[PDB]
Amino acid sequence: PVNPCCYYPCQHQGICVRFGLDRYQCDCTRTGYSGPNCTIPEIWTWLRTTLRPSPSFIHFLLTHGRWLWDFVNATFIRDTLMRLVLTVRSNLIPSPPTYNIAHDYISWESFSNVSYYTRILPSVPRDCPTPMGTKGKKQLPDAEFLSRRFLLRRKFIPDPQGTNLMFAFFAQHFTHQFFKTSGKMGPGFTKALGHGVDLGHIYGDNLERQYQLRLFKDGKLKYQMLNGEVYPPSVEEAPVLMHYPRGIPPQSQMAVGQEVFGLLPGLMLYATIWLREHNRVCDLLKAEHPTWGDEQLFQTARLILIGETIKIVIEEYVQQLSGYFLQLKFDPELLFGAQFQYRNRIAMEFNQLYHWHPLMPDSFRVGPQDYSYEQFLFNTSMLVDYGVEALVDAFSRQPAGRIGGGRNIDHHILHVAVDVIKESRVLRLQPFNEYRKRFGMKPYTSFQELTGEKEMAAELEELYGDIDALEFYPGLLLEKCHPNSIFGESMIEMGAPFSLKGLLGNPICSPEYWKASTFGGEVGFNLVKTATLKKLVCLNTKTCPYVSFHVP
Amino acid sequence: APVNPCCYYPCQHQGICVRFGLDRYQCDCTRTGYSGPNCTIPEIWTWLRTTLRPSPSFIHFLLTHGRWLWDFVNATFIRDTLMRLVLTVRSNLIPSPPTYNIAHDYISWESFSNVSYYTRILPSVPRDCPTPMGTKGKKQLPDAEFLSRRFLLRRKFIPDPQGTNLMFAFFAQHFTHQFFKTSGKMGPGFTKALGHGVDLGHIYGDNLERQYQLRLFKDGKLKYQMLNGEVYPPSVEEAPVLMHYPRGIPPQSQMAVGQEVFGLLPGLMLYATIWLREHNRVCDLLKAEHPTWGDEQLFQTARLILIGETIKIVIEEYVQQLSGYFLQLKFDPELLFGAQFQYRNRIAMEFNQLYHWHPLMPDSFRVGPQDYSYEQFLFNTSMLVDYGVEALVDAFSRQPAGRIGGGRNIDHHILHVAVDVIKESRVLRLQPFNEYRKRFGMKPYTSFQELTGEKEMAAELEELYGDIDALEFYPGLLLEKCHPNSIFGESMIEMGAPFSLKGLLGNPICSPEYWKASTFGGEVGFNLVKTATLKKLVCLNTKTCPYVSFHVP
Numbered sequence A: 001p002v003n004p005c006c007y008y009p010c011q012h013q014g015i016c017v018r019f020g021l022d023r024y025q026c027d028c029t030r031t032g033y034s035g036p037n038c039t040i041p042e043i044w045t046w047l048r049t050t051l052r053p054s055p056s057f058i059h060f061l062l063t064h065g066r067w068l069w070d071f072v073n074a075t076f077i078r079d080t081l082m083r084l085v086l087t088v089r090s091n092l093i094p095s096p097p098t099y100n101i102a103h104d105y106i107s108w109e110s111f112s113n114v115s116y117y118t119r120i121l122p123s124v125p126r127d128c129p130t131p132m133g134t135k136g137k138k139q140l141p142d143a144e145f146l147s148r149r150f151l152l153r154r155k156f157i158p159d160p161q162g163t164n165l166m167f168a169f170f171a172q173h174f175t176h177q178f179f180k181t182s183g184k185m186g187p188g189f190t191k192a193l194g195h196g197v198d199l200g201h202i203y204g205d206n207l208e209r210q211y212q213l214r215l216f217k218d219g220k221l222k223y224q225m226l227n228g229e230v231y232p233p234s235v236e237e238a239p240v241l242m243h244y245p246r247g248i249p250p251q252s253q254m255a256v257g258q259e260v261f262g263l264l265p266g267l268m269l270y271a272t273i274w275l276r277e278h279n280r281v282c283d284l285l286k287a288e289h290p291t292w293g294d295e296q297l298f299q300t301a302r303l304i305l306i307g308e309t310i311k312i313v314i315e316e317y318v319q320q321l322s323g324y325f326l327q328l329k330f331d332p333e334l335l336f337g338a339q340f341q342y343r344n345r346i347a348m349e350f351n352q353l354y355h356w357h358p359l360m361p362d363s364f365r366v367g368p369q370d371y372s373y374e375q376f377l378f379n380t381s382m383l384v385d386y387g388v389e390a391l392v393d394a395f396s397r398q399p400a401g402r403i404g405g406g407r408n409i410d411h412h413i414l415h416v417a418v419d420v421i422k423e424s425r426v427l428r429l430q431p432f433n434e435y436r437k438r439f440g441m442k443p444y445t446s447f448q449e450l451t452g453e454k455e456m457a458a459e460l461e462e463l464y465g466d467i468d469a470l471e472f473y474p475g476l477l478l479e480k481c482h483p484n485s486i487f488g489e490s491m492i493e494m495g496a497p498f499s500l501k502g503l504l505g506n507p508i509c510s511p512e513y514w515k516a517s518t519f520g521g522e523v524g525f526n527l528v529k530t531a532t533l534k535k536l537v538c539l540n541t542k543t544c545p546y547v548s549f550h551v552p
Numbered sequence B: 001a002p003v004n005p006c007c008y009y010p011c012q013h014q015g016i017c018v019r020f021g022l023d024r025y026q027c028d029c030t031r032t033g034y035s036g037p038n039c040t041i042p043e044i045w046t047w048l049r050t051t052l053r054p055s056p057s058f059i060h061f062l063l064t065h066g067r068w069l070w071d072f073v074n075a076t077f078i079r080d081t082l083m084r085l086v087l088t089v090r091s092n093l094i095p096s097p098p099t100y101n102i103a104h105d106y107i108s109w110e111s112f113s114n115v116s117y118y119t120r121i122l123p124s125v126p127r128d129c130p131t132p133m134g135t136k137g138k139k140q141l142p143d144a145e146f147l148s149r150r151f152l153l154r155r156k157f158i159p160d161p162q163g164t165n166l167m168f169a170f171f172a173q174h175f176t177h178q179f180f181k182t183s184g185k186m187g188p189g190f191t192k193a194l195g196h197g198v199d200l201g202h203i204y205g206d207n208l209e210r211q212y213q214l215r216l217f218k219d220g221k222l223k224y225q226m227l228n229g230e231v232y233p234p235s236v237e238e239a240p241v242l243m244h245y246p247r248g249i250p251p252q253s254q255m256a257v258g259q260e261v262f263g264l265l266p267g268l269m270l271y272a273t274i275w276l277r278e279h280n281r282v283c284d285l286l287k288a289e290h291p292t293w294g295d296e297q298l299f300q301t302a303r304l305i306l307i308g309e310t311i312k313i314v315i316e317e318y319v320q321q322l323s324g325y326f327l328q329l330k331f332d333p334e335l336l337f338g339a340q341f342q343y344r345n346r347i348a349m350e351f352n353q354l355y356h357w358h359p360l361m362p363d364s365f366r367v368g369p370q371d372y373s374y375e376q377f378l379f380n381t382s383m384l385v386d387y388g389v390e391a392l393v394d395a396f397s398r399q400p401a402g403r404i405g406g407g408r409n410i411d412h413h414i415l416h417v418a419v420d421v422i423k424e425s426r427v428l429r430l431q432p433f434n435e436y437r438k439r440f441g442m443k444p445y446t447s448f449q450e451l452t453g454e455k456e457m458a459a460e461l462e463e464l465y466g467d468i469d470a471l472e473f474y475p476g477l478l479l480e481k482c483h484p485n486s487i488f489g490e491s492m493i494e495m496g497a498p499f500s501l502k503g504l505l506g507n508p509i510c511s512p513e514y515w516k517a518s519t520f521g522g523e524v525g526f527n528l529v530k531t532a533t534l535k536k537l538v539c540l541n542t543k544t545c546p547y548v549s550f551h552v553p
């Protein structure tokens, strides 16, 4: 008998429980729907859905009428909407977390074993006819082929939103604190046990490593002076494990939180800015609290940067990426009246989705000089050569490529996308259309409806066989972009919930922690409350370059 | 030279004392409902609320009186209304996410994330204070041992007036030893029970490897053995798990269970046997319903069912007995679905102190005509299989347990534990009993007599401590006067309840996300939880059904 749950019978988040040898049951508890497949709505569920304007309609209003938005951004209504975006978006992400690579059911082990990435939809039952359940071909498209046909960059397509490399590297740096797949354990396993903005990519994903990077004086982090400038310490001074190519000596490697950050000047640039920033804040506190020791200085410094990080991400990073006219705001207090759980768990779907590799350019222009991937990648000297200001101004001026759209991943890193597709299949992620529905969208009815065109659509169709067999990642990247946008509808509708929950679900956002004393007084508190990308860079550099997420 | 201003505990109503400069301090009264330098000026509403709040003692009275009136209420919707009130009101007293730990008397990411630490409600007494308790009392605290033989040592056995028995005393020990599991290797303030709550790790193991060792790996079942045609935990030979049995005891005589320490007492191993029986039983109920299920899902779903069974019996029978209320307590996770509640819990060190209910233990253990001594009971690897579950359950269910509050009621055989508790309290540098009184919404004692309710002990305690404001946390709890005909006094309830209710309702299975019939494998597993009962727990797992209760007949 075919596993009845391969048909994904239960709608609206209802749970498909298998009974007997051939039956199944949908647990529609609190779905707002009744019936065998959770399809008969309640009068209230019926209104709400039938009155909800499409994602596209909303996106429109948010990116138009600058004049209207200007007023709004100046009234209490800005908060009202910000609170709405926050709650509405978050309800989509389950808390406490549900399934993991090992359990497609709730279990104490899933709830407690933090080494697993969680997942929103259980996997495609291993006993289904096809790889995606019931539809599609018995074999899925060669990952590599699929990668060269539709993802490979032919000619560079820049992002129309004006996003640059300063933002592209910020995203890479940022996300690599919570996405840290255990190579030793396999897919579905993470080393980033903080599952969120713990700033472990600065301090270490484990206590020992933290102690190694710590100066143990004034709460300061170790470092070194080169050209009279401050840079991360050497692997010699701070004997921490880093991933540098064989043959590179300790004395020649810089020690930072994330082991992998040595493979790119853009990453190590950001590691330098934040190391600079931690020690700076350590001084502000010491002045205020001479009685404080190293630990408390260190500990309070870390909480301040965590707050700084969450602010800049919401108000500048996400502001850029959304391209909204509504002025986003970071105020943990808008949630103090809501029923919100300050807890977060990195989902595997979120890791797939954040493989924004198409951002990377064809080359890296640093002034009159233009560097190749082969000159940029692994270059252990470019940062100290140019210095923070020089690289920040550079990345801030060079445009980053479009994310959504198709065929815009530079050939040098196209292997990553191939791997992402293969991993998706190991994890046995459900079809793109299932996630569409799961995140409140209607599933695509044709490959053309998805792509918005006819060439690719037709080939994808002849490859997948059924739109209902289109995979999660390919579907996200090949889906048509919103007009003049960096990506399309799905990336926002699916990525935002995961994103907003992970920022607001941080314990420092809870009323219990959001107190001036948590940060060491008004001083530390305002550092958080007023954090800004320019301040972050500029208060830590001899001069202040063009610093922005938008290309000039 | 300048005395740490925070040794004076300046900030009232939960305001935080932040030290500034070399000699200043500041109180963070953010959201305390009080303003001012020391968080002392209330807001109109805070003022009303406090000035209109009837005392703990008044409330306790109403709750234990007017049965006929309680009988009517218990039958209206008014029972849920109050149950929800008790739940929310009680819980707000416990911070979430957690705050301080033995290492940080400030909020920090490490405290928030390092789960090896027990948390704490009040930061320690600054190491730079004049006296050990801050500002008051003598420069040296009472000898722990002395203090223990004068006021805590049992002269004559005082039974609990509430009718609590050994079935309950052992249930409490078994239960609490799943979340209280101090790391001997790491020292005080460190726990091995990383579940920080009702994870049933004292059945399954506090770590994955141990779990795998105890698992049969068939039908989701747990390993076990047949002795006298009855089921008992497997041998350490069969399930090579580390247990704490004195050197010299054959492994052939060691039973392997979740909690390493449960071999020290027939009462503990009795309960480990009932639950092992119960897990496998539920495994069968599910397999029947889901033939397609594998071992893991059977195992996993079985464990969630017993976690629910455990939380129900604790609230409706265990806490019902202990409180002695006429209001019929209820376990319905749904009463909290409208409240702002965080489904998260973290074991506090103060909770560990408070739960050292050692005075419950009797002078000897009567099992029928036979009466056993501590030397025949403790570490007796054969009494359980000899007598069997039914025989011991009926026994413990009939023998009364001793009063907890009051003083002079800890049997000499285990009085050392209380001595250690007092010494540890000082390592952790817990604040004075009066501080916690206030912290949990009570007015601090003004005299040793007001606390004890008499004059003899009071006067000696006074010449020992010097100031009531120097009375330590644990001694204060045990020496404080009991509510009339109660097992303990006001503080044990007002302080222990918040910690307790939060830890039961803060379990993830109580969240709307998990409280679904599918979480338990269908209506079947769901009702097992919804209808759990002490008698069913025992009796559905024993050839016969003995007198089984938390109340002595």
Ligand code: HEM
Pocket: A168, A169, A171, A172, A173, A175, A179, A180, A181, A264, A351, A354, A355, A356, A357, A359, A360, A413, A415, A416, A417, A419, A420
């Ligand atoms: C010079 C450009 C970059 C290079 C050389 C690069 C290379 C890689 C490689 C090799 C992997 C490792 C796993 C695999 O082989 O599948 C990977 C994974 C990943 N990359 Fe990049 N990447 C770059 C930029 C970015 C950017 C701009 C982002 C977007 C924020 C990003 C996001 C990710 C994510 C989230 C993962 C998975 C991390 C994990 O599971 O631990 N990468 N990248």
Ligand code: HEM
Pocket: B169, B170, B172, B173, B174, B176, B180, B181, B182, B265, B352, B355, B356, B357, B358, B360, B361, B378, B414, B416, B417, B418, B420, B421
């Ligand atoms: C036969 C009776 C019992 C004996 C032999 C006994 C013995 C002990 C001993 C030796 C300690 C170990 C640490 C120390 O030496 O300070 C201890 C701790 C403890 N006991 Fe008991 N106990 C008994 C009954 C109970 C009961 C009835 C309860 C009440 C529920 C209880 C609650 C506790 C708690 C919570 C701890 C601390 C656990 C930890 O920190 O890991 N004990 N007990």
Ligand SMILES: *[C@@H]1O[C@H](CO)[C@@H](O[C@@H]2O[C@H](CO)[C@@H](O)[C@H](O)[C@H]2NC(C)=O)[C@H](O)[C@H]1NC(C)=O
Pocket: A004, A007, A008, A009, A035, A036, A037, A039
């Ligand atoms: C609920 O969904 C099921 C499955 O989608 C529908 O019934 C059939 O179920 C069998 C076995 O699961 C499948 O092989 C078929 O594909 C389904 N047939 C059809 C026509 O969909 C069923 O119609 C749905 N029930 C209700 C009440 O909507």
Ligand SMILES: *[C@@H]1O[C@H](CO)[C@@H](O[C@@H]2O[C@H](CO)[C@@H](O)[C@H](O)[C@H]2NC(C)=O)[C@H](O)[C@H]1NC(C)=O
Pocket: A113, A114, A115, A185, A186, B207, B208, B209, B212
């Ligand atoms: C979290 O879950 C993983 C996966 O089960 C655990 O790792 C396994 O542990 C068992 C028992 O120690 C080993 O036999 C396996 O080799 C491990 N598998 C993997 C993929 O590493 C891990 O130990 C769990 N962690 C905790 C803290 O419970």
Ligand SMILES: *[C@@H]1O[C@H](CO)[C@@H](O[C@@H]2O[C@H](CO)[C@@H](O)[C@H](O)[C@H]2NC(C)=O)[C@H](O)[C@H]1NC(C)=O
Pocket: A369, A370, A371, A374, A375, A376, A379, A380, A381, A382, A383, A385, A386
């Ligand atoms: C690492 O980056 C440095 C630049 O910071 C590279 O050296 C420069 O190479 C360009 C050629 O494109 C020359 O015009 C510059 O004069 C060089 N400057 C210095 C200071 O060497 C270096 O070649 C890069 N390393 C690798 C392996 O490509």
Ligand SMILES: *[C@@H]1O[C@H](CO)[C@@H](O[C@@H]2O[C@H](CO)[C@@H](O)[C@H](O)[C@H]2NC(C)=O)[C@H](O)[C@H]1NC(C)=O
Pocket: B005, B008, B009, B010, B036, B037, B038, B040
């Ligand atoms: C706030 O509480 C303090 C301490 O209980 C009161 O007086 C302080 O006394 C301590 C010990 O003698 C000294 O360290 C301080 O210098 C005193 N206070 C201050 C503010 O410096 C103080 O009067 C209380 N303030 C109010 C308004 O009640």
Ligand SMILES: *[C@@H]1O[C@H](CO)[C@@H](O[C@@H]2O[C@H](CO)[C@@H](O)[C@H](O)[C@H]2NC(C)=O)[C@H](O)[C@H]1NC(C)=O
Pocket: A206, A207, A208, A211, B114, B115, B116, B186
């Ligand atoms: C949780 O905190 C404890 C206490 O700091 C950590 O244990 C210490 O770890 C350091 C670094 O490995 C050692 O030098 C000490 O010997 C340890 N102290 C104790 C009392 O064991 C522990 O490693 C932390 N655990 C995690 C997972 O972060």
Ligand SMILES: *[C@@H]1O[C@H](CO)[C@@H](O[C@@H]2O[C@H](CO)[C@@H](O)[C@H](O)[C@H]2NC(C)=O)[C@H](O)[C@H]1NC(C)=O
Pocket: B370, B375, B376, B377, B380, B381, B382, B383, B384, B386, B387
């Ligand atoms: C362990 O408990 C058993 C009872 O289960 C003890 O054996 C009994 O001891 C009493 C008094 O000592 C005798 O009157 C009974 O005849 C014994 N009963 C049985 C079934 O043997 C045993 O002595 C205890 N072990 C220790 C070391 O004290």
Ligand SMILES: CCCCCCCCO[C@@H]1O[C@H](CO)[C@@H](O)[C@H](O)[C@H]1O
Pocket: A039, A040, A041, A043, A046
């Ligand atoms: C004002 C009262 C309006 C009630 C409208 C109820 C319409 C419910 O429409 C529902 O749509 C699903 C898909 O077609 C079906 O599976 C349900 O049987 C059907 O009732």
Ligand SMILES: CCCCCCCCO[C@@H]1O[C@H](CO)[C@@H](O)[C@H](O)[C@H]1O
Pocket: A042, A043
């Ligand atoms: C306006 C024409 C259709 C009106 C249908 C109104 C039905 C009232 O809806 C009620 O909703 C409750 C949950 O919200 C259910 O428990 C009740 O059974 C249902 O009757």
Ligand SMILES: C[C@H](C(=O)O)c1ccc(-c2ccccc2)c(F)c1
Pocket: A085, A089, A318, A321, A322, A328, A491, A492, A495, A496, A497, A499, A500
């Ligand atoms: C605030 C806004 C919204 O909820 O509409 C929003 C928030 C977050 C994202 C976002 C999506 C994917 C990765 C990172 C950020 C996004 F695209 C849009």
Ligand SMILES: C[C@H](C(=O)O)c1ccc(-c2ccccc2)c(F)c1
Pocket: B086, B090, B319, B322, B323, B329, B492, B493, B496, B497, B498, B500, B501
């Ligand atoms: C329900 C009731 C209440 O809140 O009043 C209640 C709840 C829990 C306890 C309790 C106190 C200390 C240890 C274990 C349980 C208690 F004594 C009373």
